[PDB]
């Protein structure tokens, strides 16, 4: 019963960061080797755990969070960082035990004329709680006068589209991100590394 990490990592379609996907990994044996053996990933940064020795530890539950963002914004997906993606799309806990993995996806997620299916939230009234999702489409009042359902000055639609083109630079090129959350709770451990 090997853990289904391939479904998250090799998925044909990835979610937008505002509507990021979470998959629970449980009651399975996890080979993290597939991840560390690979030369595929541009970012593999682990907090509270070494990239190696994950197999020797056992985790009560694992959560895999998948989204697509532009490459520079991978720097936002880290504990304690600030910015549009961290503040309004995906927030990582300060006490984060897990790994952040990212790879370039330009041939998969870019098209001539641009791919505008991937989206991000530019504005929110408050900064997001850790592991919180907002899929709202309400107009944002950045000014004193109410919007009354109409976009305008200081009244804006919350969401905008990344424009992903092959001609774009790597920082603005599409990148696929999986964040692995390892949790310790007072429960028998569903997910265990193969060694133990």
């Amino acid at each position, epitope marked *: 019963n090997l853990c289904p990490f391939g479904e998250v990592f090799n998925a044909t379609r990835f979610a937008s960061v505002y509507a990021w996907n979470r998959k629970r990994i449980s009651n399975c044996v996890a080979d993290y080797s597939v991840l560390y053996n690979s030369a595929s990933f541009s970012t593999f940064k*682990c907090y509270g755990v070494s990239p190696t020795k994950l197999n020797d530890l056992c985790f009560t539950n694992v959560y895999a969070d998948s989204f697509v963002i532009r490459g520079d914004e991978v720097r936002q997906i880290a504990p304690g960082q600030t910015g549009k993606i961290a503040d309004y799309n995906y927030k990582l806990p300060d006490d984060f035990t897990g790994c952040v993995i990212a790879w370039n996806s330009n041939n998969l997620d870019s098209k001539v004329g641009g791919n505008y299916n991937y989206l991000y939230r530019l504005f929110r009234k408050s900064n997001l709680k850790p592991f919180e999702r907002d899929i709202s489409t309400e107009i944002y009042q950045a000014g004193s006068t109410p919007c009354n359902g109409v976009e305008g000055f200081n009244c804006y639609f919350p969401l905008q589209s990344y424009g992903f083109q092959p001609t774009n630079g790597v920082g603005y090129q599409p990148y696929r991100v999986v964040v692995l959350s390892f949790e310790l709770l007072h429960a028998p451990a569903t997910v265990c590394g193969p060694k133990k």
Partner: antibody
Amino acid sequence: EVQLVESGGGLVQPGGSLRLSCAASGFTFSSRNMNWVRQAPGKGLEWVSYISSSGSIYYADSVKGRFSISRDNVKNSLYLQMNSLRDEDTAVYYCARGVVGYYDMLTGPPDNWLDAWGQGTLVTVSS
Amino acid sequence: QSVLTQPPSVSGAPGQRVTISCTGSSSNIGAGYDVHWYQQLPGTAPKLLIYGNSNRPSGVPDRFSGSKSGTSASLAITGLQAEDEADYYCQSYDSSLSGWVFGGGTKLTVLG
């Protein structure tokens, strides 16, 4: 909120030594990597030293063999020890907070963008 | 002699757009190493305006923008405002030096 306080600067003679201390409040100091950056009067910024959460240390070539970096997580403090001081070492030294420390399977330099800066301590070396 | 070279002075009256450039070498920018941009008001400690070549920290106005091409990297300021006047610095990592490198710095004055 985040407070970074630098102390131990003064006017000292060339060939002298002194210790700079940075006291940190408002954040979890152990998790953050920390840096020392200096700015000479009417001049640009120069990076001096870096200390990771793990304790990995990198020094600039100009300061190697004369400056040392230390951290005490109980006292939430960063320390820079300066020996064989030169006139070129005269600058305002800034305590700088780096990114949250991480273990990287991939090769390459650590992420070091300095979001938090102290007001600084001026160190003047003159004969 | 700075590994990253910046224009010394830039001038613009309010509401204009100005660009600040950070030139690079095969060791620092153009090796793919990230460029960070800092703003320093006179008599104050430096403040981070752009990190990860393009990302903007919270509380930093949308007018500031970051882009990079080849060895060079640029910061764009639009809708210029009096508070924007500061000395601006660019940061990157140099492989030969085995340390992070800062530019000489640029002085921007809103013409006022």
